[PDB]
């Protein structure tokens, strides 16, 4: 397997911070973060917005730097990392939930491209799905190299064309002064808002090691996560709020259409989805490879076929389902981190032989974290991450050995 799905990335295949910075910005530069940014924008004061977006994405940035640090220290995908805490076969459970929801998001994302475009152009929505997902599936066959190519192309155009569009929109609106006078008629609960920020990428963010395992230097992995999730996801949130405030449209590609920038709009839509969806498919192949021992390349292509032929169905009904399953993903992150923090020395080698088949305490910890998210007050994802990590740190030394 060229994606090294079954063991540590060897020294000659490692990559530098530049490629991994763009790959990860390619993940967060995504329309759904713009949409959520418009919700936060219309439901919060100008100060509350930047406080919620900055606090939330910094929490995201710290959570993902840990995972990226561990991914890079070891050269292991999230799924191989999970073998330490969940067991060799126990990890199939996180791997399927993480991988499956990403196949979900991929199909969703194919529809997010083909639907606006076929409406704007009259072209058959079905035909566009076929062509979009097929193109996106072919590129994932070529692995971390393809993700590097797409995002070093996509990310500059999105940041720069998108930023210019934000500038126009605040200018034509009366400038910053007008923007900071807009008032929500029904302000959003601040803690709900934090959950929406963190919740925009905690699922893909829990698979950070699948990409930054390629980094030679663990400290650089921390920089990648912060640049991508603190700075990058914030920028996407600002795009969405600016578009909501100036025009009632939270996707910057709707703003550009409003401004007569039709070609920038379609290009920015296609580039932001293609990068996020390729990451999704890539990580899902790694995840299903941990389960089946098959080539992650082959599985990624299979995942893209299924995701394409089911795109609309996933866009419609299965989004509430995709959000539901995903509630088990944050605790899985806290367990992995906590197990590394507790048992660093264990991670010195990738040694199948000292590993468990299944650690029931890991599964028990995930359930507890889910309960902590559903009951405890505060920020649901943070409570759900800390639920799994704290209860694992308590019960694993006791009930495992
Ligand atoms: C040849 C040119 C073709 C280019 C056509 C492509 C441009 C289309 C851009 C995306 C298509 C529509 O995108 C649409 O944006 C609105 C923003 O109000 C999103 O709405 C979103 O923002 C609101 C707040 O505004 C949030 O409460 C919520 O998270 C979400 O529903 C819609 O969920 C999405 O359907
Ligand atoms: N593929 C994804 C899109 C949006 N958010 C995620 O967490 N993952
Ligand atoms: Na993207």
Author numbering: 4 to 404
From the publication, what sentences describe this entry?
CodB is a cytosine transporter from the Nucleobase‐Cation‐Symport‐1 (NCS1) transporter family, a member of the widespread LeuT superfamily. Members of the family are responsible for transporting nucleobases and related molecules into cells, often as components of salvage pathways. We show that CodB carries out the sodium‐dependent uptake of cytosine and can bind 5‐fluorocytosine. The overall 12‐TM helix topology is very similar to Mhp1: TM1‐TM5 are related to TM6‐TM10 by a pseudo 2‐fold axis and intertwine to form the bundle and hash motifs.
CodB was purified and crystallised in the presence of cytosine using the lipidic cubic phase (LCP) method (Caffrey & Cherezov, 2009) and the structure was determined and refined at 2.4 Å to an Rfactor of 20.1% and a corresponding Rfree of 24.6% with excellent density. CodB crystallises as a monomer with two molecules in the asymmetric unit orientated oppositely with respect to the membrane plane. Both molecules adopt an outward‐open conformation (and EV2) with cytosine bound in a solvent accessible polar pocket and density consistent with a Na+ ion observed in the conserved Na2 site. The cytosine substrate is found at the interface of the hash‐motif and the 4‐helix bundle, sandwiched between two aromatic residues, Trp108 of TM3 of the hash domain and Phe204 of TM6 of the bundle domain in a face‐to‐face pi stacking arrangement. The cytosine forms two direct hydrogen bonds to the main chain at either side of the breakpoint of TM6 of the bundle domain: to the carbonyl oxygen of Ser203 of TM6a and to the main chain nitrogen atom of Ala207 of TM6b. In terms of interactions with the hash motif, as well as stacking with Trp108, there is a hydrogen bond from the cytosine to the amino oxygen of Gln105 of TM3 and a potential water‐mediated hydrogen bond to Asn280 of TM8. The sodium ion is coordinated by the main chain carbonyl oxygens of Gly29 and Phe32 at the breakpoint of TM1 of the bundle domain and the main chain carbonyl oxygen of Asn275 and the hydroxyl oxygens of Thr278 and Thr279 from TM8 of the hash domain in a square pyramidal arrangement. In an unusual interaction that is not seen in other Na+‐coupled LeuT members, the side chain of Asn275 is also within hydrogen‐bond distance of the side chain hydroxyl and the amide nitrogen of Ser34 at the C‐terminus of TM1b, providing a further link between the hash and bundle domains when sodium binds. Between EL4 and the tip of TM3, TM10 and TM1 there is non‐protein density, which we have tentatively modelled as DDM and monoolein respectively. Although TM10 in CodB is one residue shorter than in Mhp1, given that the temperature factors are high for TM10 and the helix retains the proline on TM10 around which TM10 swivels it seems likely that the lipid‐like molecules that we observe in the density are preventing the conformation adopted in the substrate‐bound form of Mhp1 rather than a substantial difference in mechanism.
